[PDB]
């Protein structure tokens, strides 16, 4: 299960945050700052995997805004990257040419999509079209 997911920009600003572990607000902020510093202080050939606090911190940013995850040391490492890619593809399909500008303004939509896709740190829908259809149906409810 993913302990936490933090979508941070290249400049260090965070556009998304979703932690599945109940932590203090100050502790959560410190952890986010440390993760941003570690990711921002890493090269492009670091394997996209960091063992921070005994957590397989996987970073894979496909644009200026980066992505982060906190997977426990009990599952495969490529699974987190595959899940991140699937989530990015689903968000792009739901939004349509998703960019950094739409993420900040449409943070509620991204949060709803993440909730409908991953709940409690585990995957909820393996397919990419069923989740999109469910999100569209929920949005069309009003």
């Amino acid at each position: 299960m993913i302990h936490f997911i933090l979508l941070f920009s290249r400049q260090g600003k965070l556009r998304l945050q979703k932690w599945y572990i109940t932590l203090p607000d100050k502790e959560r902020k410190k952890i986010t700052r440390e993760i941003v510093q570690i990711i921002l202080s890493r090269g492009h050939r670091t394997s996209s995997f960091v063992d921070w606090k005994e957590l397989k911190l996987v970073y894979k940013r496909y644009a200026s805004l980066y992505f982060c995850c906190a997977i426990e040391n009990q599952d495969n490492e490529l699974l987190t990257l595959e899940i991140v890619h699937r989530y990015v593809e689903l968000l792009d399909k739901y939004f349509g040419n998703v960019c950094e500008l739409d993420i900040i303004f449409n943070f509620e939509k991204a949060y709803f999509i993440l909730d409908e896709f991953i709940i409690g740190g585990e995957i909820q829908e393996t397919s990419k079209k069923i989740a999109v259809k469910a999100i569209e149906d929920s949005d069309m409810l009003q």
């Binding site: 920009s9 290249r10 496909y62 644009a63 200026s64 990015v88 998703v98 960019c99 950094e100 500008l101």
Partner: peptide, 10 residues
């Protein structure tokens, strides 16, 4: 800018 670019460009 660098923000208007698509995350995956699909």
């Amino acid at each position: 800018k660098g923000e208007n670019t698509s995350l995956l460009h699909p």
